[PDB]
Amino acid sequence: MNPPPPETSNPNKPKRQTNQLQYLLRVVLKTLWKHQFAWPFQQPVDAVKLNLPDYYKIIKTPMDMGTIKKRLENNYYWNAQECIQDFNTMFTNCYIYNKPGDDIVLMAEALEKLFLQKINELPTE
Numbered sequence: 205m206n207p208p209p210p211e212t213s214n215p216n217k218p219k220r221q222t223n224q225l226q227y228l229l230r231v232v233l234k235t236l237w238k239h240q241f242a243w244p245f246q247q248p249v250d251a252v253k254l255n256l257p258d259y260y261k262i263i264k265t266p267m268d269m270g271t272i273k274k275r276l277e278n279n280y281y282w283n284a285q286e287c288i289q290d291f292n293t294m295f296t297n298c299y300i301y302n303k304p305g306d307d308i309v310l311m312a313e314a315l316e317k318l319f320l321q322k323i324n325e326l327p328t329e
């Protein structure tokens with residue numbers, strides 16, 4: 205079975221809007237979402253449908269851009285570093301589960317290169 209997706213709304217978690225979090229949603233997430241290679245990363249890994257019975261035996265901290273989108277739009281994050289961490293967790297999950305040079309890994313690496321280019325332009329708080 206698939207696990208439930210990560211929490212994206214918490215009424216007990218304090219909320220904040222910052223110029224950096226706005227940039228992460230309106231620039232970073234939007235740009236990665238529209239990339240030709242984004243489609244495997246736009247939702248939780250459906251290990252049942254994809255026939256990956258071991259995915260959630262290996263990946264105990266799942267993450268994906270659909271979850272990141274919801275977290276951003278819900279003001280789930282207090283600081284930009286939490287969101288940057290979620291992107292990095294997503295990429296690392298892909299690398300852990302697969303092998304260097306795999307198609308999906310080349311796709312993730314291209315997305316990560318673009319992500320890092322956009323983070324280098326993160327505005328000061």
Ligand SMILES: Cc1cc(C)cc(Nc2nccc(-c3c(-c4ccc(C(F)(F)F)cc4)ncn3C3CCN(CCN(C)C)CC3)n2)c1
Pocket residue numbers: 243244245249250254255256267268269294295297298301302307308
């Ligand atoms: C290239 C390609 C080819 C095909 C046919 C379909 C897809 N679609 C797709 N959709 C969602 C996840 C993945 C995916 C991820 C993966 C891991 C972590 C994340 C992250 F980052 F979100 F966490 C994101 C993604 N890892 C491997 N796959 C593939 C590898 C190839 N298999 C083929 C069948 N296999 C049983 C042998 C299917 C799963 N692939 C992609």
